[PDB]
Amino acid sequence: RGSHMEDFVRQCFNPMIVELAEKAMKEYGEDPKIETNKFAAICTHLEVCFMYSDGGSKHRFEIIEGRDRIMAWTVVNSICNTTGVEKPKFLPDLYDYKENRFIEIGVTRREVHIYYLEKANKIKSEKTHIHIFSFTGEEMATKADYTLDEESRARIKTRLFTIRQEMASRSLWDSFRQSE
Amino acid sequence: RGSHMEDFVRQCFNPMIVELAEKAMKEYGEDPKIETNKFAAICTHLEVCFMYSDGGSKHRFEIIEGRDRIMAWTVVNSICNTTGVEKPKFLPDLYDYKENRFIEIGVTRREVHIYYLEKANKIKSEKTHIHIFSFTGEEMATKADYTLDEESRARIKTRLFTIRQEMASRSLWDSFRQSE
C-alpha cells in the first residue's frame, strides 16, 4: 500500500505507541498499512490514555488499554474483587483508585455531545465513568466531573490540536475527519 | 525437578525479586526447584514489601526484608540506637520513619484473622506493627492503623489477586493454597 498516512503515523507517534497500536489492530484482524486512518486513531487514543494516567498522582490510575484482551480482563477482575466495584460489560481504559471507578476515554472528530451519546447508550454499564476529548479542544465527562485538574486536561487538548495541524499540513486531515 | 510452578514464578515475578528469593531460600537450606510453592510465596511477600515501601513518601520507609541476615540486623541496631525503639526479638520487614515503628508484613492464603492471631502470638514483641494482606483482598493491621492511604493498599491487593488468577489459569492455585 505505502500510504502517506502510515508514514506520518510512524513519524509522529513514539515507537512504543506505534507498536502497541499495531498489535491491537492485528489482534482484531486489521492491517495498519490498509486501515491507516484507524491506525492513526488508535495511536492517538493510546497517547491520550497514557497522558491521562500521568495526570494524577503516582498510584492513582491503573491502565487497562494497551494490554492484550486476556490480561486486561484479568486486571479488571482483580480490581473488581478487590474494591467490590461492578464488573463492566465492556473493556474500560483506566481505573481510578482515588475515585474508585473505571474510566472510558473517547477521542472523536465529531461534536462531543454526539459522541458522548453514542458512547453512553452503548456503554449500558451505569458505573463506569466516561470522558471524551475532541480534536477541536472540547471535552465532556460524566456529571461534568473531569477527574484531573485543568492543566493536565489542557495538555491533552494541546497535543490533540497539534496532531490535527500536522495532518492538515500534509492534506491528510480531511480524509481522517471524514472516515470516522 | 522441572515443575510448572517454578517456570511460572520466573515468568511472573521480576528478576531482582526472583534472585533475592532464591538467595533467601538457599541461605536457609531450601531449594526453589523443590520447594516451589515456598518459592512462589517468598517472591510474593518480597513484591508486597517493596510495593508497600513505595507507598509512602521518599524517605518514609527503611526496608529490612530482602537483605542478608547480618546486614538486616545491623540496620535494625542502627535504627534502634538512633530512635530509641525496642530491639525486636524477630526480624521485621520495614521501619516507618514517620510513625517510628517496625512493620511485619504478612501475606496469607487464609483468613486474615487466623493468620494475624498466629502472627501476633508468635510476634511476642509488643512494639512492632503488624499488617496482613490476603490473596482474596482482605487486610488487617494493628489497631486498624493501616499506615498507607487506601490507593497504595488497593494496588497491593489488586496485584495479589492477579497472581491468584494466573496460578488458577495454570491449575497451580489449589496446590498453592493447600500448601501453607
Place this chain on the structure above:
Amino acid sequence: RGSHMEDFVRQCFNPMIVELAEKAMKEYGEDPKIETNKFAAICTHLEVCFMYSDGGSKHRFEIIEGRDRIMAWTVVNSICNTTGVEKPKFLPDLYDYKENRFIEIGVTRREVHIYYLEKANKIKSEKTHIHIFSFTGEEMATKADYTLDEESRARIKTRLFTIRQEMASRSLWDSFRQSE
C-alpha cells in the same frame, strides 16, 4: 576564527543547549564561530528558559523556545485554540498552563528597567507576560507577578552570576557586556 569565547561556551554549557543554540543561529544566517557573544547569549537564554520551566510543577509549563520556528508556532496555535488565548504577534518562550498566559523571558546585561521598556514597547501584544533576568541578580516581571517561587528564581540568578564570573576570569566579560 577560533575565539576563546567559542571554546568557553562549549565548555561551560551542556551539549544539548550548545547544539540547540547552534541550530538557532544557523537558521537565521549567523555563525557561532564569528558571532561568539551572540552564541554565548543564546545558550544563556536557553538555559534560563529551561531552568524556568523546571521551577513549576510537572505539567505547568509548555516550552516554546528551542524548537524550530514552524513547530513553535504550531504549538502556539494549539495552545491558543485550546485555551482561547490571543495569538501573540511574536514568538514567546513558554506557556503557563496554570496562569494561562504566554511568557517572554529576557536576559540582559543592562538595567532591567531599560530592557523591560524596550522588551515591552516592541512586545505590543498586551496579553503575554514578561519576565526579565539580569547578570547582576535583578529581575522585573509584569505586574511584579514573578510566576515562580523565590527559590526557583534564586537558582536562575545564581547561575547567571556564575556565568559572569567565569567570563570575567577569562577577560571575556567586558567584551560580552559591551556587545549587547
Place this chain on the structure above:
Amino acid sequence: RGSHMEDFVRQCFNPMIVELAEKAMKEYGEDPKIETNKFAAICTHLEVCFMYSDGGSKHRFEIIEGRDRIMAWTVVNSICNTTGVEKPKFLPDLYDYKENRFIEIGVTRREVHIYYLEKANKIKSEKTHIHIFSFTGEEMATKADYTLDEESRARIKTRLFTIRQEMASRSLWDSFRQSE
C-alpha cells in the same frame, strides 16, 4: 601501605564519594593510603552532606562541598551577590535557598557539644548555620533549628551508626574514634 581501613572505605562508600574524597585529600597534600582514617571521615562527611541536600525539596539546597576550591567559592560569590547574604570567611557545605543561609555540617566521634563549641568559636562568621551529627545518634543545630524534618535527619543518623558497626565488626572503630 595497604591498610584494612582503606579497603573497607572503598567497599563501604560508593565510587563517586570515594573519588571525590580522594581528590579532596590530594588537593591538600594528603594520601588516602596513609591517612586512611581521614579518608574514612571525608567519605562519611561527603555522604552526609549529600543525604542532607536530598532531604529538602527539589530546588532547596545548593551543594558547596565536593567541588574544587575555586568553583566552590565562585558559587558562594554568586549566591552572596544574588541574595545579599554576608560572604562567609570560611567555605560552608551547603546553601539553603528556602531559609537563605549557608550551612556548615559537622560529623564527629565526640560529644556534639564539644564539637559544636570548637566548630562555632572557629566559625567566627555569625551568619552561617551550623548542624552537627554524631556517630552515636546525637545532633545539635544553631538555635535548635534543624532545617530538615525528623525523617530525613533520622536516615542520616541510621547511616552513621551503620558505618560505626561495620568499622567495629572489623576492629577498625577504636582506631577511628581515637584519631580525631
